[PDB]
Structures are given as C-alpha cells and as structure tokens.
Curated annotation (Swiss-Prot), chains D, E:
It comes from Salmonella typhimurium (strain LT2 / SGSC1412 / ATCC 700720). The active site is a conserved redox-active cysteine residue, the peroxidatic cysteine (C(P)), which makes the nucleophilic attack on the peroxide substrate. The peroxide oxidizes the C(P)-SH to cysteine sulfenic acid (C(P)-SOH), which then reacts with another cysteine residue, the resolving cysteine (C(R)), to form a disulfide bridge. The disulfide is subsequently reduced by an appropriate electron donor to complete the catalytic cycle. In this typical 2-Cys peroxiredoxin, C(R) is provided by the other dimeric subunit to form an intersubunit disulfide. Residues 1-156 form the Thioredoxin domain. Belongs to the peroxiredoxin family. AhpC/Prx1 subfamily. This is Alkyl hydroperoxide reductase C. It catalyses: a hydroperoxide + NADH + H(+) = an alcohol + NAD(+) + H2O. The gene is ahpC. Keywords: Antioxidant, Cytoplasm, Disulfide bond, Oxidoreductase, Peroxidase, Redox-active center. PROSITE patterns: THIOREDOXIN_2.
Length: 186, 186, 186, 167, 167, 186, 186, 186, 186, 186
C-alpha cells in the first residue's frame, strides 16, 4: 500500500526541452509532482496519454505542479521519440529514463516479466507524500482531466486542514468540516 | 503491485438490501466486480462516494458488474448506517464487513496504524484479475463516472483483444490497434 | 492468566458524554478501573449489561472507580449507537473504540477469527494491577452488582493489608487474620 | 482467554467421600462441571469458598452439575484436610490433587513463582466447552450464588438458543 | 552427578518447632547440612525415614550438622502433618516446603511425571560442597546410621586430608 | 537423577578371573547388577572399597547379583593391578575398562575435566532399572554391607509388590501395606 | 569465465527486416551464432559497430552463421532506430530487445548500475557451446573480420577434431596435431 | 563481466630473462598491462601464442605496456620451458607462475575441473582498470596485433576524454565526439 | 588423523615410461601402494628422493607394491622433467599430475598457501587402508630404506594376524603374539 | 595437516624419573621436543619402541631434545608400568598421562572408536612448529634411529636456512642449495 508514504530517493537521466538533465528526489522537494509511468517509447496508447497531460501542462505549472513521465527506456530514446512523434513533440516536462528500473521499483510499479513499468500515475505533495494513486491494465487509458481534479482536491485539502473535498469535488463547492455534529447524519 | 493479479479467496458477512448474507470469491467468479473500500461507517466524506456509486448502480448491473463496498466495520454497523442515513439508504449493492481485516489485507489496503481500510477502488474481471486500481488520500473523493469509463473500457479490451482503447476514451470513439507498422507514428 | 499482572500501555479514541476524547494508560494511574469488553455495537441483543453498569456508574464514581467499555468498533460507531439506543444513551462513562485490536490483545481478549473481543471484565487497581477477571459466553449475564461487590472487596484489602476477605464478604462482616494459631481447624 | 474452548485431557487422583478415585476428562462428558481452583490446603483462611460450594452442592447436583475442587497439593493432603477441619468435612464433591500442575496449566491458572493455583472458577458444559470464567486476587471472595446464577443461565441459553431481549 | 559441586541458591518457607521460617543457602554457610528429600507428606508409609533422622538429630547437632527435610508440599502442610502424627511430631529440624519445585530441581531430584521428589539424601559441607549422595527407589530404605557414618568420615577427611591407608 | 531409569546399551572389554571378556547390556538382562565406579587403577590409596565388595561377592552371587567394577583405565591395566596388589587380587568379578568413557557417561558419572569416573555405585534390577544410587567424595567410604542391605530390600519389594520397606528393614521385620486406613496418624 | 559453456535458454522479441519475431535458444540449435551486445540504441559508438557487422553479414550467412544483436531497449525501439539511421538501416539480421535483462545476464554481460549491456561479442557453436568471447570498454570499438577470423578457425577445429589451430592462421596455412612428443618441441 | 573493473591484489613468483622476481599489483600501477593466460607449459598451442607476443614485445614496451604471461605451473617450470623450447626461449617478458590459482581466479579465468587457466587476454590501464577482454576455446589461437590495435585505441581514449573510438580505426583516421545531437544521426 | 582410513576415489593423468596413462583408485585395489607426494617438478631435494625410490623399485615390484609420485604439476611437466633430469629419467613408476589438487587434498596434504603438496609418504594396503604415514618439513629428506622396512612390516602383519612386528623390525626376527600371558611383563 | 603448524597449549601430569610433575607447552618453548604417542601401558609392542628411544636419550639430550611419551593412561599407570617392566624402567624422559584426551586431540591423534592414541611421533622445534610427523598402524614399529636422523636434519636446516639436506642424509655429507641456476639439473 503506497498511499500516504514518502517517496524514496532516486537519481535518473531525463530528456526535457532539448536537453539532457539529471533529476533526483531533491528536485521534487517542496513541489507538487506527478509521476507518470508508462511501459514503452515508440508504442501507441502511451503517446495520447502523454500528449493529453502535455495539453494540461500549462495549467499544472501555474498550480505549482511538476510532471515526470517515466519508462524503463533510456533518456536517449526519449529524445528520439520526441523528435519523431508530433504528439510527443509537444511535451515540455521531464521525460525520465529508468533503464535500471530503480525508480519504477521504488513505486512498486514494475511488470517483472516484461521489464516495463505498468500504467501508473502517482500524485506526490511538497512533503514527498503520495496523495493519490491510479494504475490501469495495458488496454485502459487514463484521463488527464480527472488527474487535474484530484490535484486540485489534494491542494485544497493541504490548504484547509480540518476541511475535506467530497465525492465529485470540483472548483468552488461546499466542502465538509469534520466534527462531532456531522457524524452519522449525512 | 496488485495490477493484473488474481484476487485471493475470502469469506465475509455482508448487509445487502435488508438482509445478512455471506460473500466469497466464488460469488465473483464469471462476473465483473468492483471492490470499493472506505475507512469507516458513520463518518463524513464516505457516504457521498458510496451514494454516487449507488446512483450508477442499475447501469453497472446492466453491464454485469457487481458492487461490493468494504470497511473494517461489522455488517451490523452497515445495517445500522443504512437505516440512519438517507444517502446510505440508497445502497442496493452488498456492504461487506471486514472486522478481521482479511479482505482488506488481501487487497493490501490496510492502514495498519489505524485498523481501517484506505480509500481504494478495485476493478476485477470475470477471471478474477484486477484490471484497474485507484487509491486516494483521506481528503480526496473518487468519482463514480470515471469509474464507469474504466469499466466500459476494460470490458471493451476483454471483448476486442488485439485493439486497445487510449485515454479519455468513451463509447463510440476510435481505437488503436497494436501492430508492427504503426510503431512510432502518432 | 493475567490475574495480578500490570496493565499494558495503550492509546485509544473514545466517545464520552457527547465528546471525543483520547484515553491512555496514564488516565488510569492512581484510579480504580473497570475495563468492560464486549463484541459489537448495534447487534440485535439489548445491551443490558452496559446499561446495568450505567445504572451503577454514579456509585462507582463515588468509590473512585472509572469505567471504560471497549469493543473493536470505532468511537464514531459508539457515538451513533449512543444516539440510537435508549439503553446506550444512559452511558456517561468512556466508550473506547479499538479498531486495531491492540487494547483487546493487551488483555488477551480477542477472538482472532472474528476480529471481536470476548465478553470479559477486568478490575484494575491504582497501581495498574488486575485484581479480578470475569469472562462469560453469550447469553450468560455479567451482573453489575457482583462487579460492585468485588470492587468493594478489592478496595477493602487495599486499605487493610494483613486482613483478607473470604468468599461472602460484604461490608460489616468478619474478616480473616494472618495467624499461625490457625490451621486444618477452620 | 480460554472462554469458549474445549477443556484439555487430564488424569488426576482425587479424594471423594472417604475414598481415592481417578478423575479424567472422560468423567466430564455429558455433564455440567465446575472446576473450582484454590492455592493451598491447610491454610490461613477460613476456607469458606469451598464450604460455600458445599452448601450449594445438593442444589448443583439437582441441576446435574458436578463439582471439582483443584489445588497443587496431593490427594493425600486433601484427605488429611477433610479429616481435620469441620468446614472441609462438609465437602462431598471430588477434591482433585494436581502436584504436577498439569491440570492447572490446562486452565492457564498457575502462579508460576509460587507453584500454586490462582483463585479461578470455570464452568464447563456437557461438550467440554468453557462457558464462564472467574479469577480473583487473594483478598476478593468468589460468591457461590452468583455461580448458580451463571450456571442456570448457561443451561437456559443452551436449551433455548435465540431467546434474548431485543433492543 | 552433582557430587563435589556447590549447592545453588534457594529461598523456601519451612516449618520448624512450631514456627514458620525462611531458609536460604546463606543459612547453610559454615555449617554441615543434610538435605533429606521425600515424595509426600501425609502418606501411606510409616514415615520412619524422618523419624529415624529425628532419633539421631541430637547427635547430628553435636557434630554441628543441620538437617533439612524437603518435599514439594507446602510448609502449611508440614505444620499440619507435624500436628497429627506422633512420628512426625518428634521432628525438630526444619521441614522445607518446595511447591515450585525449585529446590528439588537444584538437586536434580524431581520425578517430573509426578511432581514429587525422589528419595534422595545429600551431605553438604560448610563451603556448600556436596560430599555424598544417596538415592533410592520407593521400597528401599535409607539407613540413618550409615548417614552418620558418612558424615563423620566427611568431617574427618576434611580435618585431616592425606590420611588414608596405603596399598 | 537417573533413579528409576533403564540402563543404556554398552559394549566393553573386561578383566575377569584371569581372562579378557566382553561385557554388554545383554549380559545384565535378567540379572541383578551392581555397577561399581571408581576413578583410577594403581593410585596411592588402598582399594579397600573394591576389596570389601570382593569379600561379599560369594554372597552376592548367591542372591543372583552380578558385580562390575568400572574405571576409565584399560582392561589391560586392570589385569596388571590385579597381579600387583593383594587386595585387588581378591577380585573375581568383572573389571570393566572404559577408556572411551561411554559407559561412565551413560551413568552420567564422568569428571569431564579429569577424564575419570566419580565414586558412584548403581544397583540395577533384572529389567534394567536403576533401583539405588550412591556417590561419595574421596575419603568417604562406600560400605559393602550397606550395599547388601539395599539389594536385599530391592529384591524383597520386587518379590512382594503391594508391600514397601521403610527405612530400617532387614529380613524379619514388619512391612508396610497399601491402605487408605492409614494417614497423618502413623 | 563462460568460455566453453552451453548457452542458457531465453525468449526474446526481436526486429528483423521489418517484421517482429520471437527468438529462442531453439532457433540457434544446429547453427553457429554470434551474439553482439551493445549498451544503447540512438547512441554514437554502437551503429558503427553494428554496421561494420552488417557489411560482413552475407559472408557470415554463407558460413551458416546467424547474427543476433542485443541491447536492453525494446524491439519496438530497434524498429524505430532502423528507420531513422542510414547506418542502422543496413542491418538485415535480428535485433533482439532485452528489456528484462535476462539474456544479458545469461551471458554475464550486465552493467548492473546502468541497466545496459557491455560491448561483448560471443561465438556459439551448433551445439550451443561458447567458443569465443570479446569485451571492450565503452570507448573501444570492435573489429568485424577479427570475428570472421575467429569463426572460421572455430569451425575448422570442430570439423577437424584432434587438431588445434595456432596463432594468426588465415585460410590455407598449417595446423598442429596434439599428443605425446611434439611436447615441449615447438 | 569484469570489463571496467579494477584488478585485485596479487603476489606471484615469476621467471623473466633468467632471474626470479616477485610480481605484485603494485608493479602494474602507472603502467599499461597485458595479462596473457594459458593452460599449460610444455604443451602445443601455447608457445605459438606466447612467441607471437614476444615478436611484438618491444613495440609494446615503447608504448609503456608491460606483458605478463600466466599459467598455473610454477615459476620453476617456466624457467625450464624457457631453456628447452626455442620458441619459449625468445620471451623476455615476465612469466608468472600461479600454482595457488589465485591470480587466475581474480580474473575469473579458471577451468575449475582442470586446474588450468583459459585462453584469456586482459588489457589493464595505468589505474588498474580492465579495458579489454578476450577468451578463446582450447583450439582457437589469439592474434598479437589485434591486441596492439586494441591497446593503442584504449590509450587514445584515455588521453583524449570526451571522445570515443569507433570500429576498425588504425592510427591516423577519424573519431566520434559524444553528446546531444549526433544522436541517432550517424 | 588419516591413519587406518580407506583412500578416497580419484582420477588423474600420469606419465609412466613414455606414455600418458590414467590412474584411478581402481588401479590400487588389491595392490599395495605407495603415494609419494612432493612439492614441485624441476626443484632439488625432490629428485634425489624420487630417484632413491626408483633405486628400490625393482624390489618393491617383486613384493607386489606399486608406486605413485604426486605433485600439483601437470603430467605434461612430468614428461619434460623425465627427459631433462638423468635422476628422474630412471623412474619407471607412475608420475601423477594433480593440478586440481584433488588427490593431494584427499590425503589432506596441501600447502594451501603455496598450492603445492607437502613432503608426505603414504603406504596403502590392498583393501585401501592407509597403514603408514610420514610427513616432513621442506628441508628434511625421507629415507627409502626405512620405507622398505615399513612395507615389509605392514605386509607381515597382514599375513600374520594375531602377530606383530616390534621396534626395529627387520627380515626374519622374533615377532610378538598378543596374549593374556604377555601383558605387562616385557 | 599439522605439518609446519604450531602446537597448541596443554597442561598434563607426568611421571618422570620417579616423580610426578606437570608439563605444559611452556616447558617446550625454546627446546626441541619429541612427542611420542602410543596406545596403551601394559601391552606388548609399545615398550620396544619406548625402550629404543630411551636408548637414544642422552644423545637426544646432548642435542637439546626433550622427549615426551604420551598415552591416554594416567601418570599413576605410567609409574606402575615403570616399576614392573625392565624395559620401561630404562625411561628417563617424561611419561605424560592424557586421560582427558586433550593432548592427543591437539595432535589430531585419537582413535575415537577406542579412547587410545595412534602410534604417532611428532618433532617440534623451539618455536613450537611441527617439523616431522610419523604415524604407523598398530603392528608396525617405529625406529628411533631414523627419528634421530630427521631431528639432526631438522636442526641443520634451522641452523643453515638457505640450504636443504636431501634424502638419507646424515652428518658430514653434501647439501643442496636452492637457487635459480640449479633448477632442473640433478
Ligand atoms: K530499456
Ligand atoms: K472493526
Ligand atoms: K503443593
Ligand atoms: K505437592
Ligand atoms: K601446477
Ligand atoms: K584412560
């Protein structure tokens, strides 16, 4: 159960906007982060999901949220994919390579018989605590707008302790304030 | 992780539509199942998620999908809750009590600290295989619509093996077909 | 058995007279205590046993005895029961929730295959020593006035070391006295 | 606790009404039993817990309940006690000797630093199941009328499962 | 065997001449001791091993030898026995109770299946060393004059090492 | 202690009346036996104890008692001692050599830091059960006539089960008899 | 070292001249095989090495020698590289993808800290026995006919048992015939 | 594999041009080293291999490269071989004897069943790092200037960091300069 | 203590009268054997000892005694030594090579820090039982005439069980016949 | 093996020239020592070996050599034996008793089967190092002359480090000097 645990240290090469950079956990400290795992560069279902997040990246950045896509491919491969796919071309966040699989396994997200990461998305808060987890089968695409929903929910809860965001929570809704009075009445 | 793994045997008591029944893994064989974990009866956030799922329930039933809500409370407490809340009153799917924690630990979903289940939703296919997982922090509500989307998508890949449905996919829109030729092009 | 051993440290949430409080072993130090275990809130039997203790609680408090009921349900569930049942509504002592089972296991009183406590009562003195234990099967009532009797006896021996109370003692009766003057004769 | 578990096998010598007999768990089958433990024969207290049970023994026998007192003394010592104290002389139930401590540990009722049993009473139904347990410190008396009350309830729920007061 | 080893520490309650006392290994320091074990108070035999020691107790005291009888019964039970049997009533040495069995196991003298001590006698010198051991089955009597003979020899070799008969 | 346990199998060389023989536990079956241990051949003390047994050997043989002396010296050394010492020359019973120490350790009678047996005597009945043990320190003599006494007592109880011999018994005296007629009175 | 050992079983996906195939150890039986490992697709040193081999590939096929290149990238990635590099484009032999790293570890050829295979070349006979091994540092390129030189020599030895081939021999020059007294003579 | 690892310490006796010397890892520091392993003195294939190296030995010395041949025979035996074979006689580099097999196991080069080293050649840089490895079967001879080719290439890379040397390069031809976008370009 | 134990199986190559043969324990069965260990071919002290035995070999053979010299050198090396030393040249018995050290270690005779056998001589009877052992320091030569003495002693004892050969035993001397009569008189 | 190893500490009682003394490893420091093991006092073969050593004893003493005979018998038995045998009577070196077997097991020389030492002779130098070992079967006598030869040889190598004395060597004859040049020539 990795929900509500702190992410483990890591150090990986990544491709980001035409450069190779190093990313470590220190980059994520004090920031909101999305770790977006996918199985394989040059595949199919994967780009539309990565592109979709890219579509939301301007808004994520305005909200102080960084994004890291991760596969067991090399950063070298990411750079190539980025130049040959016009969907991937629009990605401006870090594409992390994890050929040792270390980062994938920190998140218990390896397909051990394929040596590829599972389709998993992790939301990590500025204290390194995992606040949301999504994992789907090889054939089921994720939904970046729902990802946005959860991040805003997580950010809200962080900013209003003692308050919570209910089912269907969206921008500006009545929230709940835990209390002795509210128990069993809803 | 538990993605793409088969669920483990269990035998639990439940409240369902005014009666106490036993539920086991055998009751799930050949059915789609959703296992919907939450931390505690009589709290605040929980009903809204549970009511929303109930709102989608005939539609889920029309899709051959069974719903099981699960907490570490007893079936007695579920029955009581069902009487005192207009929201919980709306529930016609089984409310499983897991006071030993065995069912919860089968899904690796226990807060050992607290003796309560985390907010996790699991989709399980007729072969017992977990096809989607969602876990969120205490303050972040799930969304039963996105749940349906994944289920519809899961059934689709089950029903159309060599094709996959990419992100945000809903009924009637275009699929991708993994093959050699398509490698690297979107 | 645990007779004449010291209670172990514990930390639990409780419902007590309309508020949530924390109880620890520090709350028992210097006080007499009754730990009153039972299997489950909201079952179908009338919670007569708990009501009987409530009936005697003013008197117990005058003897400086604190009462704690304990089950593996949450303090949230205790609050609900207390609103819904006329018998339970009489309770002004602390109702401890023990969903982790730690307090119940400290007193070796768990039904491990059910996740519920057995019907056991423990009398604990101000130094934390267990001075009396009672456990009964379902349907065999724990009598609150026998509880009072044992407590008054325990307080008496504490105040009068060198004297012991045989079977039969109630206030005003003869005591027995260390002697060498004494045996195979009585 | 041992509540709702089956008693373990045992074989002990006992004193009963002027003779020595052997008692085993086979003697408990089909019967209600009370196992009444205490620390020591020939001791400083008015043995009024045992006298109290004796006083109620006729009534217990009418309910088809057998009584066994148990301590870690020998059956030899029980016989001597029974023939020196007017209170013990009233006892007509079996006085089991448990010098190995085996029976006592079966009921998890040993004071290991003393080699004596704690003041525990156990009610056992005809299938060998423990339906009630009571343990007290040395200054706190076991009440025989409360025992009777509990035995009659145990027999009642046994013959009429299901009849308890709703909420 | 435990021959020529130092006795282990112990703390037991005893009956001695109408009072209860505590006995420990500190009580044996500087003294000769006989530890006389037996299985059970209030038993079927003429307790003539103990009576025999009593008969020789004055003489043993003149040799500066203390005697301790030991069984797994309580000191309580020893007191009762001493006040019911004319043979036991003759005993003026300490009757140690060993209900935990600790003292008995120190002398490796327990019948584990019975919870009773075997018929063993041990001679212990002023430095706590065991100089003689005797153990017998239940039908085979321990002779007190042979004990005296062995104690006087042990004291003699202790005061005069080196004087034994050549070959 | 080893009282009332069965002797263990053994196989040793012995010197007996001018010949070397083998002794095993099979030689003791159906016979009464004395195992007479001592530390060392050819020491400076007179082997009075062994001579005393030799003095009583004709009588012991009439009671059907076999005698075995045992030390950790060889049977070769026993032969030499027997030629050189007038006391030892009287011996017509078997002198077992135990250089491996196995027979001595079977009777738990080894001084492990010296490699020599302690001064111990064991009486063993025809079923191989040890009925009496005597161990003394150096200089404290084992009396052969006390040995005879214990043997006659052991044979008596064997022939008269239901009777036991108190301390004091020699042939012709009263016996004690199982009774219930009997105690705290004698 | 692994010289003169049998290769271990494996199952890998591969790219070859526009099709995806499964390669297993069974496909190498009764054939000579060259396993050509490299760290990473889309790099710099690697293509020059692979292309060098491709130049010689027909001559290798006439000798009944199959070539397998291997990296820890996926077969998907090989296909992409094959279409993007004019140098990689000339490869007509199988490019095996080894994302689990199993095939690489079988040949003990993993940089465990990096998740990439070392620059190693292995010659494997029709019976699966490794007959030649080469490994170079990241900066040192291999030489394609040194390989050829070693293969023909390996093949001649197999077909002419009882003879061994000395240093530097090229086709048509003399060999040594092992035994009794050439010893120490050459 | 051992490529790119530091050599382990060793201490061996050796024969060199009529003297016995002790060689240790200290003697290789700040020098380039070739370790030339072979199974057995007085054989057949071995001298042709060693003599081939001897032919090139001066050219190796001008490059500051020391040569060490190694077998599990003693240094005594090397001296004997050196005086009996005209081919071995031309060796002026150190012939190390490795009768314990330790040096051979350090390079993981033992035939454990035979007690002989395999036909392996190791190139070691001044910092002790193995930069090149070759192993051939019993019947396949090595090639002395392939070695030379690899050494100069190894040396050029060391003295010109940030550059790597592609396949087949001989003195005077062009090298590659690693980074950002030559990627996938050659 | 290997005296009086059976030799362990082995299989080694050996040089004997111009041929290479295989020797195993089966060769030694039913024969007397001498295993003559020495540290190293081409050394100094060793030849005179081996030559010395060679001087006695005709007589050893007449007595049905085979000889095996053993070192950790190869059989190849033995052949060479045999051709270059006129002392070794006169050896007509098997010279066993033990480069794995297996034979040396069967006899617990390895100098583990040198990988050479110690100076040990073992006499083995037709049942494989070791009847005599000699081992000396590096500087102390053995004496083949004493070896002859012992073999004849061993053969005698084998042929006359119940009889023994005393100190100084030589051809035709009074022997000793163990008996009860002889004990302690000599 | 124990060749060239240091002897272990011991503390034993002994008979020497009419008195009982203690012997430890400290008594051997700085002296040459011979440890002469035999199985049993009062037997047959043993005295002849022991008497012969005594015959050489002043000469051994003149060489600074101490003799210790050792059996698992006591010092008492040694003293007795010394009185009854004219051969043992001749002994003026220490006769150590080892009834615990510790001294014997230090030299790994126990027949565990029997509790007796094997016929072993050990030569130990002033530094505690074992320089020669001889072990023979029950029926094969040692020869004190060959013993002297080894000792004289051992002292020689001690006194002349770079030279060794070869087989059959006795005083005044030629030595060999290990050096480079001599390798392979005798
Ligand atoms: K990869
Ligand atoms: K619960
Ligand atoms: K007792
Ligand atoms: K007792
Ligand atoms: K060698
Ligand atoms: K011995």
């Amino acid at each position: 159960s990795l929900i509500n645990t702190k992410i483990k240290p890591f150090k990986n090469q990544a491709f980001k906007n035409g450069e190779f950079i190093e990313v470590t956990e220190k980059d994520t400290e004090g920031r909101w982060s999305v770790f977006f795992f996918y199985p394989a560069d040059f595949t199919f279902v994967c780009p539309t999901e990565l592109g979709d997040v890219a579509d939301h990246y301007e808004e994520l950045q305005k909200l102080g949220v960084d994004v890291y896509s991760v596969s067991t491919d090399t950063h070298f491969t990411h750079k190539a994919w980025h130049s040959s796919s016009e969907t991937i071309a629009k990605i401006k966040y870090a594409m992390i390579g994890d050929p040792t699989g270390a980062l994938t396994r920190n998140f218990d997200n390896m397909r051990e018989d394929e040596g590829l990461a599972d389709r998993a998305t992790f939301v990590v808060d500025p204290q390194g605590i995992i606040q949301a987890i999504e994992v789907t089968a090889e054939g089921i695409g994720r939904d970046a707008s729902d990802l946005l929903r959860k991040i805003k929910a997580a950010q809200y809860v962080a900013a209003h302790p003692g308050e919570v965001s209910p089912a269907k929570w969206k921008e500006g809704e009545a929230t709940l304030a835990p209390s002795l009075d509210l128990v069993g009445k809803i």
